[PDB]
Design an enzyme around this catalytic site. Structure first.
Site, short mmCIF file in Angstrom:
data_model
loop_
_atom_site.label_atom_id
_atom_site.label_comp_id
_atom_site.label_asym_id
_atom_site.label_seq_id
_atom_site.Cartn_x
_atom_site.Cartn_y
_atom_site.Cartn_z
N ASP A 78 0.84 -1.18 0.00
CA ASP A 78 0.00 0.00 0.00
C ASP A 78 0.89 1.26 0.00
O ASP A 78 1.87 1.32 0.75
CB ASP A 78 -1.02 -0.14 1.12
CG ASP A 78 -2.25 0.76 1.01
OD1 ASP A 78 -2.08 1.94 0.56
OD2 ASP A 78 -3.34 0.27 1.42
N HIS B 146 -0.76 4.47 -0.16
CA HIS B 146 -1.56 5.57 0.41
C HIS B 146 -0.96 5.97 1.76
O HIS B 146 -0.69 5.10 2.58
CB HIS B 146 -3.03 5.17 0.64
CG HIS B 146 -3.75 4.72 -0.61
ND1 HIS B 146 -3.66 3.46 -1.14
CD2 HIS B 146 -4.54 5.38 -1.47
CE1 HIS B 146 -4.42 3.38 -2.22
NE2 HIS B 146 -4.95 4.54 -2.44
N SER C 277 -5.17 -4.67 1.75
CA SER C 277 -4.44 -4.27 2.95
C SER C 277 -5.08 -4.79 4.25
O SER C 277 -4.36 -5.02 5.21
CB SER C 277 -4.28 -2.79 3.00
OG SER C 277 -3.48 -2.31 1.94
#
Ligand code: B12
Ligand SMILES: N[C@@H](CCS)C(=O)O
Ligand SMILES: [K+]
Ligand SMILES: [Zn+2]
Ligand SMILES: [Zn+2]
Length: 862
Positions: free
Chosen positions: A747, A749, A800
């Site tokens: 991930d 982000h 995730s």
């Protein structure tokens, strides 16, 4: 068999195999049952766990061996020369491993390679010493009825880094593997791999050895993951597996560098995702008993198929492991692997979540004046910045064509590809009409490449040559709807050419549907000829038909072409609308630049409907859509300036929101300064206009009205604003405790996370922010170093939340009971409640403030 007789002179099936018989890969996947029936080693792997031997080298070092033992001073310390000068010593070690319970021994041949042996003046002896190694193991194993693995290691020279040519390296594995095969080994084992391109090189060389000698055996490939988490040249586990799943290999695994502890996440990833059998051979220090417990976990819990030891493990380690693993039933292997390609560094899904797979095209000499100029001027630095610009704008992969009439294609690739190999984080779509160029490229580019174009323009032989190349090197393949009759222009021609190509690639060559990206063509509908008017619609209708008729396949288009002939604004609008139309018909990938599109959210409803009328050729005596569409942009020429003045006219706060939505970086800091001078606080601006802007971008992306590049443009505005505002933020407390914070593996982000970092830091908490894609090992290294009150994990992908669960499992297994705070938009409170089953001390954080309150509670409000 129809297919045995249906080869052209272009077919090369020795390395990759064809689509029938015993080939490692066929249409349906890994050809497990057929190869289990042919090969006793694979049958055994189906039926029970196979115990490997332990170290050879560290066993040899315990014998007090003199220069005379090695044949003289020159050869002293070369393990493999002992196959000629002290065979009985190599054999005795095999005998100790078999008596301990090993059903598979490895030949003393890891460094029986030309360039490694040259160190000792033995370069010409590789085949000999490999053959004697296999004979020694055969002599020990045959009374026990055990398997012999012909072991070849990575050598001393890294091919991805230019330290040796693909050809010298290829020749070294070939001659060595020849020795092993003539010696009677039951399988070839490529082990301790550090360089993912070497893996491809050696797999193909060892396959060629089998064909030369007339003897095929299973191929087992083991990489080494360093203590840092990757292969030495930087390849993660995901990129490693993606690069292995499409090659002619039977067994994937790992060995060396670390003990099973650090290996655990990487072994679990292989056990969980690979269609092949999985092996694991940790290094040691590690007691026999410990190794036996880790292999019991790996076999019984994860389904690992073969287990042994590397450097530092002796017979005693293998004894305890064989006692621990005897009689466990194998778990079945997964049957499909998601379609994925890979750079040196990272895997990339061909089915991208919530998005097309976007292939940048600026590295194309034909389509790009900038790239052409830089190529001819040998401007390496400029080409890499251009590469980076594209990846920064959201390119999942990069189309590369250097072909230019007047120039040597092969010279230009030889110049450029060594630098792309190590510089690129994303895969390469190799773009060329020359199979020789393709084959050259596949000697330089690590990972899983894409090939831009199998087609039937220049005969079946070239098609078969490209198809064969893709099958052997494990490449994904663009299939272009052009045959002997020419370009397919109608839906009927496109389907017919696609079906013929599909059947040849799947049934004859053994490519999986998932490897294929069908390119039905993109023609200009702007020239205005009655021929060219339905050509977009034809591609769209063909694509829908072939989507139902060919589950598994992908579709790719070079979309900019549709609008060739138009003015820039008209092009951007037609390209964007065509792309969205194609998405609705089954499109999975697109060759396109960010500059040649715009968000559908930014397209007036009238331009939108006119672009639909043009694409679908809604022509009447009333109205000619091409002329109406051109006339639209003629009659709204000032549109750019009404946008700019209307933007600059907005109230301050709404203007901040708009900068996010429309990606307007320029003048951002001045507006933010203006807002701070009027008395607005940083956190007000972040939680208010700025995140309101991100909320709207999310709504537009989720509604299909904004593409990835514009979300990245919104993201850049958001992060520039947070970086400008962070130093002005008012502190609100003094040392209350410590948080280790990370976005989990896979991930990228981090806007959520970094707000968390900033809010907590300013309410008096020490925040150790480890960044993005953080593996659980690095999280826990940080926990150990900083001894924090809690651990924070951010996750925004659905994927995730699964990484978080596994992270909690990994933490339970090693004794951790510290509070874990989980947050991110993908994750619900109901879900974290359920994870309490694994890990009591786990808490959910809706937002940064809820994170703050949990740190307050868990430290006694400090
Ligand atoms: C911005 C964005 C991006 C940017 C991110 C840039 C960056 N962050 O540096 C870019 C363009 C990089 C991106 C890429 C992708 N993304 Co995106 N993205 C978004 C978007 C539009 C906004 C996310 C955001 O910044 N929100 C603002 C912050 C403030 O909110 P937040 O992160 O939730 O955090 C708050 C709480 O959740 C909480 N919190 C969060 N973490 C933590 C941690 C702790 C410890 C605590 C206490 C609290 C806490 O506190 C925060 C503030 O209060 C979302 C939209 C959405 N979520 O619906 C999609 C979204 C998250 N992305 C999505 C996807 C699919 C992708 C891509 C796969 C796109 C692709 N290329 O195919 C890639 C994946 C790349 C990867 N991760 O490997 C999906 C994920 C869903 C799914 N099925 O996986 C979303 C939901 C879009 C969709 N499909 O509707 N993305
Ligand atoms: N098969 C080799 C591995 C080299 S790291 C040995 O056990 O010595
Ligand atoms: K071993
Ligand atoms: Zn053939
Ligand atoms: Zn080792």
């Amino acid at each position: 068999m129809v297919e045995v007789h249906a080869c052209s002179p272009g077919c090369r099936h020795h390395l990759g195999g064809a689509g029938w018989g015993d080939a490692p890969l066929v249409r349906l996947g890994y050809n497990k049952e057929a190869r289990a029936k042919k090969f006793p080693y694979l049958k055994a792997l189906l039926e029970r766990p196979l115990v490997f031997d332990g170290a050879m080298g560290t066993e040899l070092q315990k014998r007090d061996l003199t220069p005379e033992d090695y044949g003289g001073e020159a050869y002293f310390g070369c393990p493999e020369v002992l196959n000629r000068t002290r065979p009985e010593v190599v054999r005795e070690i095999h005998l100790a491993y078999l008596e301990a319970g090993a059903e598979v021994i490895e030949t003393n041949t890891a460094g029986a390679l030309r360039h490694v042996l040259a160190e000792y003046g033995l370069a010409a002896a590789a085949e000999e010493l490999a053959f004697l190694g296999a004979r020694i193991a055969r002599e020990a194993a045959d009374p026990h009825g055990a398997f012999v693995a012909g072991a070849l290691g990575p050598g001393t020279k890294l091919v991805s880094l230019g330290q040796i040519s693909w050809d010298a390296l290829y020749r070294a594995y070939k001659e060595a593997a020849r020795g092993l095969l003539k010696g009677g080994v039951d399988l070839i084992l490529l082990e301790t791999a550090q360089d993912i391109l070497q893996v491809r090189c050696a797999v193909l060389a060892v396959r060629e050895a089998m064909a030369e000698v007339g003897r095929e055996v299973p191929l087992q490939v083991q990489v080494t993951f360093e203590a840092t988490g990757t292969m030495l040249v930087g390849t993660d586990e995901q990129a490693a597996l993606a690069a292995l799943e499409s090659l002619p290999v039977d067994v994937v695994g790992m060995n060396c560098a670390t003990g099973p502890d650090l290996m655990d996440s990487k072994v679990r990833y292989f056990a969980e995702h690979s269609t092949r059998f999985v092996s694991c051979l940790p290094n040691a220090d590690l007691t026999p008993e410990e190794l036996a417990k880790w292999h019991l976990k790996f076999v019984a819990e994860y389904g690992v198929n073969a287990v042994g030891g590397c450097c530092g493990t002796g017979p005693e380690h293998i004894r305890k492991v064989a006692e621990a693993v005897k009689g466990l039933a194998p778990k079945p292997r997964p049957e499909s692997f998601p379609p994925q390609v890979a750079s040196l560094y990272q895997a990339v899904s061909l089915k991208q979540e919530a998005s097309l797979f976007l292939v940048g095209e600026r590295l194309n000499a034909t389509g790009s004046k900038r790239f052409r100029e830089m190529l001819f001027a040998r401007d390496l630095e400029g080409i890499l910045a251009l590469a980076r610009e594209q990846v920064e704008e959201g390119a999942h992969a990069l189309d590369l064509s250097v072909a230019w009439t007047g120039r040597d294609e092969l010279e230009d690739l030889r110049w450029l590809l060594p630098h792309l190999a190590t510089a690129l984080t994303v895969p390469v779509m190799v773009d060329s009409t020359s199979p020789e160029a393709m084959e050259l490229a596949l000697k330089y580019l690590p990972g899983r490449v894409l090939l831009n174009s199998a087609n039937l323009e220049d005969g079946l032989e070239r098609f078969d040559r490209v198809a064969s190349l893709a099958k052997a090197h494990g490449a994904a393949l663009v299939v272009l709807a052009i045959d002997e009759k020419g370009m397919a222009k109608t839906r009927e021609e496109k389907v017919r050419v696609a079906l013929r190509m599909y059947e040849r690639l799947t049934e004859h060559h053994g490519l999986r549907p998932e490897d294929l990206l069908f390119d039905l063509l993109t023609f200009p509908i702007t020239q205005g000829d009655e021929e060219s008017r339905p050509l977009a619609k034809e591609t769209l209708l063909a694509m829908e038909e072939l989507r139902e008729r060919l589950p598994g396949v992908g579709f790719v288009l070079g979309v900019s072409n549709v609008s060739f002939g138009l003015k820039p604004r008209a092009r951007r609008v037609l390209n964007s609308v065509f792309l969205d139309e194609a998405r609705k018909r089954g499109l999975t990938a697109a060759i396109v630049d960010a500059g040649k599109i715009l968000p559908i959210s930014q397209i007036p409803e009238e331009a939108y409907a006119l672009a639909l009328d043009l694409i679908y050729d809604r022509r009447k005596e009333g109205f000619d859509p091409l002329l109406a569409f051109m006339a639209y942009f003629e009659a709204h020429k000032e549109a750019a300036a009404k946008r700019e003045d209307a933007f600059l006219a907005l109230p301050l706060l709404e203007r901040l929101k708009r900068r996010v939505v429309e990606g307007r970086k320029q003048g951002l800091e001045a507006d933010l300064e203006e807002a701070l001078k009027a008395g607005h606080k940083p956190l007000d601006l972040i939680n208010g206009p700025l995140l309101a802007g991100m909320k709207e971008v999310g709504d537009l992306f989720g509604a299909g009205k904004m593409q990835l590049p514009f979300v990245l443009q919104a993201a850049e505005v958001m992060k520039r604003a947070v970086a400008y505002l962070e130093p002005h933020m008012e502190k609100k407390g003094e040392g209350k405790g410590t948080l280790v914070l990370a976005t989990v593996k896979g991930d990228v982000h981090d806007i959520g996370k970094n707000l968390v970092d900033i809010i907590l830091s300013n309410n008096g908490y020490r925040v150790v922010n480890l960044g993005i894609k953080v593996p659980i090992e690095e999280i826990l290294k940080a926990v150990e170093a900083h001894k924090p009150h809690a651990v924070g994990m951010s996750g925004l992908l659905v994927k995730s939340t699964l990484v978080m669960k596994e992270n909690l499992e990994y933490m339970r297994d090693r004794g951790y009971t510290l509070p874990v705070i989980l947050g991110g938009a993908a994750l619900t409170r109901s879900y974290v409640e359920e994870l309490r089953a694994i890990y009591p001390n786990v808490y959910y954080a809706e937002d940064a403030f809820e994170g703050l309150r949990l740190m307050e509670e868990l430290t006694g409000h400090a």
